[PDB]
Amino acid sequence: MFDAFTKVVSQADARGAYVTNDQIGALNQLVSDGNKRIDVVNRITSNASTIVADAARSLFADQPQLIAPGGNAYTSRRMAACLRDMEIILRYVTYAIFTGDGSVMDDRCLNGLRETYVALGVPGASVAQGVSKMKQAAIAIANDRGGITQGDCSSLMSELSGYFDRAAAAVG
């Protein structure tokens, strides 16, 4: 599994290179943003159930065919599996923003997920829409100015958005 630091190391080893001053500088900036990163992990994790529920509600409002009789999220078992998948993907996004690398989410969640969904008949475009709705909610919660020392978290919000976008692309 990589974190931000071992990702840099792995790319350097493949080139037989020492990590450069520019790369060291970038990792130092990540380190100096560490409190903010943990606030992102904490805020998303603390609000995970409402992020999933609210995104799911919004998905089914926009994609009513999923919950019509015969639809892929109709029956309690299929609805429960769909809500589980939304939570699974959010959980792996939190791991990625914690480590500062997307490898955990590629290796353990997304690799082969496209093919799994084909075999099951799960519509990946709707999974992607659910993921993007969780993204919107998670950024609003993580980047909320209330009850925190004021400062800029824009780099972390871009990185977080990237992990959600990576999951959305992987399922379709």
Interface with a copy of itself by CB under 8 A: which residues?
Answer: 13-17, 68-70, 75
128 binds, among a copy of itself, other proteins, ligand CYC, none (CB under 5 to 8 A by kind): none
Closer residue to ligand CYC, CB minimum distance, 21 or 27: 27
102 binds, among a copy of itself, other proteins, ligand CYC, none (CB under 5 to 8 A by kind): none
Scanning 53-61, 113-121, 136-144, 147-155 for contacts with other proteins by CB under 8 A, the matching segment is 53-61
Of the candidates 101, 102, 100, 105, the one whose C-alpha atom is nearest the C-alpha of residue 31 is 100
Burial class (CB in 10 A: 0-12, 13-18, 19+), 37: buried
Instruction: Measure the CA–CA gap between 14 and 32, rounded to whole angstroms.
Output: 27
CB 29, CB 96: distance < 8 Å: no
When asked if residue 104 is in the footprint of other proteins (CB under 8 A), the reply is yes
15 binds, among other proteins, a copy of itself, ligand CYC, none (CB under 5 to 8 A by kind): a copy of itself
Instruction: Measure the CA–CA gap between 155 and 97, rounded to whole angstroms.
Output: 11
